[PDB]
Design a protein around this ligand. Structure first.
Ligand code: FES
Ligand code: FES
Lengths: 65, 66
């Protein structure tokens, strides 16, 4: 049932705040699988998780107007 | 190690959500990273029960504006 295996395990609730107006990218993918090496950004690790596990998780994509 | 999402759109082989800056109403909006929210992709604090039951430490992503 653990979702997060390794990230900031000394912190009892990992919460990331992002300033959506400071997007340096036209879109930006944010991780919902707790496997990204760029966490809280998405690096595509979700694909390795889904393949390993048979899961169907993917990122939240933030997009500029 | 094992499944993260148990229930949400299991018919969909990859659940991706997009959000437009301009569609964000509030100065802050919480997005779920635990796959337990009844308002997915929004966070409704279901992570708290998940954390208490499993000894996990997951929390939402907060998008801040203005
Ligand atoms: S690396 Fe986790 S959702 Fe993409
Ligand atoms: S309900 Fe899932 S992170 Fe809050």
């Amino acid at each position: 049932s653990l979702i997060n295996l390794k990230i900031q395990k000394e912190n009892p609730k990992v919460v990331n705040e992002i300033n959506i107006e400071d997007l340096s990218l036209t879109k930006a993918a944010y991780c919902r699988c707790w496997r990204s090496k760029t966490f809280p950004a998405c690096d595509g690790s979700h694909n390795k998780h889904n393949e390993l596990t048979g899961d169907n998780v993917g990122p939240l994509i933030l997009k500029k107007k």
